[PDB]
Design a protein around this ligand. Sequence first.
Ligand code: FES
Length: 108
Amino acid sequence: SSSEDKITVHFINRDGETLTTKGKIGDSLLDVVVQNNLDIDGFGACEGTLACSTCHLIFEQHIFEKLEAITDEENDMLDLAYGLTDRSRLGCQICLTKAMDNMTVRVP
Ligand code: FES
């Protein structure tokens, strides 16, 4: 008698594993991971304020193209990203969307 929302998010460890964490259209990257005890030692640190450059993640196909755009500043911080794929960018921002229902990501 109020409301309820929660999506599913998957994170492929840099080792090749796969973590499962449910977000919630409106949440905020990092928080979810941090909420999962961040099982990806290396993820963002600065909270996503652009002062760590230890973030950057890979988005699932058809997902990255859905994700919102980014500025030039963040674009720079998205450079540090390793093996910048065709769907890799700096995360720890924006909020989950219905287009993220079971969104899979990878940790390069
Ligand atoms: S969390 Fe430090 S820039 Fe993304």
